[model samples]
Target: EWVKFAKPCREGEDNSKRNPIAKITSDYQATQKITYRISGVGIDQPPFGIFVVDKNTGDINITAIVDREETPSFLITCRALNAQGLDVEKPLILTVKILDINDNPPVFSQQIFMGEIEENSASNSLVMILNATDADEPNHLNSKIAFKIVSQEPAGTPMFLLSRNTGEVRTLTNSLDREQASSYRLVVSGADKDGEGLSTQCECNIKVKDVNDNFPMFRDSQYSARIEENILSSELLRFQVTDLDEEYTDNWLAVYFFTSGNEGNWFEIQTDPRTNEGILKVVKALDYEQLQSVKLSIAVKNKAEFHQSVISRYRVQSTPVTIQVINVREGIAFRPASKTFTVQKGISSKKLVDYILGTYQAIDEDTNKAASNVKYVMGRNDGGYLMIDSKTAEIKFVKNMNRDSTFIVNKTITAEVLAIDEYTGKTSTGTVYVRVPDF
Candidate 1:
């Protein structure tokens, strides 16, 4: 009539491993021998071989160890029987609950939680929520977990924090400074069993993001550089910069501008993120004949807006850089770099090759002189077929050049011309193309 359970059955137990987990004693004063048998869920069905009864002793026993995670409890129907196979008492429906223990450690979803927050964020600003879970009984001390920040990278001043009950990470403004350290690693731990049991940890990577709080500046108030005239599309010089902010970030990136003296937009400036240096490049060619030197007033500013409280923060802006343009000779050259001429195969040999061909004249880039001392001469051997006059740049037909296979490439001919500048002693060269008519 009364069923006695052995202390609600502590799991993982053994009586020399045969323990009587519970006893189903029949209160009926039996005259004819009474026996015990069990048949219900967890006894002889699908979840079979779990519970058994000694037919003579009324002792209920478990054959296998039970676990809370697999099934929390079992609903078993029991009764006492006699040799006649007749139930002697009312059937009893027993609720067997499996007690839980702190057997699992708290674990995070990821081995490393990555997150970012801006520098100078307000105190207690939310960064991200971490996740932790335990694989034990829920709504109990064994599964309840608490979060904590065990360590911070800079290892000083507790710059970050985590919720003890929730896995939310937040910023402690006094310690979150990007200029001091751009990023941080926190050893975040989660303890299960209401913070009293086994604990597990993970790395929380917090990137202290940049803010435009710093301005850019040059190394000196004045600088000097050099550039060869006619230099085009090349780096003029490297200008060093200074910014007390994170590198390669908006706060540290510099934008060079021409505060003054960047005439014709000839000079261009940009930031090299890798080196943090301002690269001054000549987008347009520089001419030494006209301007030998230029005083460029270059101002540097950060790509990001400054977070200054005052309007006039006395930021050193313009750094006057005097660039000395080196003098380079602009020697005599042909008006057009190349000349093209067409001719008939019937042209007489040994005749003066006159204006029917190219004008082939040379000119000088002399700005101070009224005229040029330019002259032309034969640049290459033309198989004695062509000749040139050194004084007037005139050409003559020395021999017949029609069907000259030595000078023809796929039905085409080319000849070289040279010009000498008497002022700078610099010589220039050009090419002349001739395509004779073919029937």
Candidate 2:
């Protein structure tokens, strides 16, 4: 029997050619000299150059370069016999394995990797992980690869953190902007020497998508439109808006609102999704006798949430919109909206609330001139609390009123009257608010 090795013998695959790698020896002594012969793969078999044993010395020499990637091990048999060709000891099977060398450079999964992240992504948001591999032995310094960002295009603030141990890249900043930079370029290095030096570089392109951060505003300083004054429940004009965000997306979708100056529910606004424009419409028929033109302040915004960081830039002030009408023959009406009469809290009938509360204030819309006639008629006097004189168009308390009176609400009595054009009989209603406290 031959002496055995404690462990399997393995040499670095980069070993030089024609080098003695291992030896097999035995203690069997006889009168004749011992001769060593080896056979099988890399010896007596095919590819018989490397791993040949010296006939007398029992030394195995490697005569060719060993590539562990191609073949990792070689098996051979050895025999020790007397020079007379007589068997001296039992044959032995031996194994010679090639050690993995740190020669292969790490390679990334792709030559160019593409990823996308939304602008203003939350802090520590995970980016795409970069994967790489090496042909060296596993769990060793040669195969322990790591990731790192070599260079970032248009560098300014650091927005990404490439964890060396793992391949995950975390976004550092929460307010990534698409307007400033819509896309970013990074060269990721995958090194096997504990990531100290890069063996290969991977092109990583990150496209920054948009969020609904911006508020929309009217493109024009003021919007102007014209309506026929007689039209109702129909769109009148279009108000164009401008927004800097992704196109044809929710971030850029327009939301229209009528913030003020749309009195009597006469006007309204809505979004034209097909065009992202504001469509202004009239809610009801307009009277040219009352108003020829109307003004409004309309606020335009995005359908999505407004970002505070860009609040100032994204701030949308209500835009002024003027609507021109074109009115017609109207009815007689009071110039003032309503008349207020102060009365005692406990006043009774036969007390004058006001005698001639401006009879001349009532006019016939057909002609403010003389000739056309007008007359006053009582329309509503709740609980008959007040009486109106058609002759003077004056009002007076017809009944007593107090804090507890069912007709008196909030210490006041409301009465309504109508002014009629005697020619056509067309009428307009006016109102009176009577206070009942004696202060």
Candidate 3:
């Protein structure tokens, strides 16, 4: 049965002068009509709080303050005796819970967060941490505040991210593309989750660094070159074109190209991106007089990309150019298995297919090399209907020939000559060709 709040107790049966069951104080009362006991309810308490009960008549008392630190929420019963002196008990609850008062302000363990991270950091990596403490003990998840990214400069956006559980700021995205953005600025914030209207937040900044990852390309391909006959092999020709990648360094800026078109060892392309120009130098000597113009086909590519297995083939110029090594050019050679030009329709074979000769403009790596070195002479073995000018590179109809006569047809024309140059001694060769009628 439930006991009364305050009850009466018997004279002998009401035990009041006995020592306290929970805690005994120096000041003890004898034969007291009321003695405090503890009930099961209202006994819950915060930290550091104490609880007690009276032993004599089961009377409960809030002898100690209800401060949670001293004794938290608890239940106790009390025994009280009226004039009748009968044994009776009363129940009283003691709820002692400590309220979270703003006793501590937030403090950053490291006010100046100095974080050194790799230029290209991965996500969730720690950039910086905001360690704060509340003087209050055991400020768990509910009381612990959270962090936020305020503003990042240079990036002007967020390049850094935060970890609430770990309190770490890390790289969020790749560094800014210097071609577009070069720097970044960031701000960080912190707030308490307690919602006590006593929240603490602060701000911080961040910066981004640079690294290389670029290859070179070109604005245009095919460049032209013109060399005078007398020019030395070491002479600089036209420069090569090149492109540069801003994200890369070293050989990424270097370019190389083919040198000479015909010379077994033609030329080499050397480039310095700092100047954005290729240094064209002949790997071999060339003559101008004999071969008035020299045309070449070569490839241009970047050194880095060319060597890198990961790179793609660079672009090449599709055009061809004629180089005029001005000074002393060499003689035009009748270049073919058979010395002759292809004859077109409408030309009478007997009319002397004058167009039956194709000339090979001579080429010399060194400047001023004259074509005069070769003495051109007509070959002796020939069918008929044609004559050639070895010195002038001309053609003539020696006799009347027809289509069925193999006239204006394929013929092996041989020319013998001695090639004398200032550098090399003497050389000669014969060329053959299949010539058709003049179109």
Question: Which candidate's TM-score is highest?
Answer: 2
Query: Model 3, residue 67: displacement in angstroms?
Result: 16
lDDT of 2 by residue, 1-439 (tens): 6853312333443455335677787776445578888788886776667676778767777777666655667777888887688877778887776676677899988999888898888899987887888887677787889888878985678888888868787788886788778888988888887976448888988988888776677778888876665568557778898888887888899888878888678877778898898888787887665688888888877888776556666544877888887756556677677877665445443454453333423766544433246677787777776666664676655564244556767867787887777777777788888775533
Candidate 1 wrongly placed segments (more than 4 Å): 1-7, 13-41, 45-66, 78-93, 107-118, 126-129, 207-213, 225-236, 243-253, 263-266, 270-276, 279-294, 302-316, 323-439
Candidates in order have lDDT scores of 0.73, 0.73, 0.46
Candidate 1 RMSD to the correct structure: 9.3
lDDT for model 2: 0.73
TM-score of each: 0.56, 0.60, 0.43
Residue 3 shift from truth in candidate 2, angstroms: 2.9
Count of backbone collisions within predicted model 2:
1
Q: For residues 258-290, write the lDDT of model 1, one tens digit per residue.
A: 889986888888778888888888888777767
lDDT of 3 by residue, 345-410 (tens): 566655644454444323233333335544444454355544555554355545555444433333
Stretches off by above 4 angstroms in model 3 are 1-136, 139-143, 155-160, 170-176, 194-213, 233-248, 259-263, 289-324, 329-439
Q: Give candidate 2 regions above 4 Å deviation.
A: 6-20, 25-48, 54-58, 73-102, 144-147, 195-198, 219-228, 232-237, 260-265, 270-275, 290-297, 305-439
Q: Per-residue lDDT for 339 in model 1?
A: 81
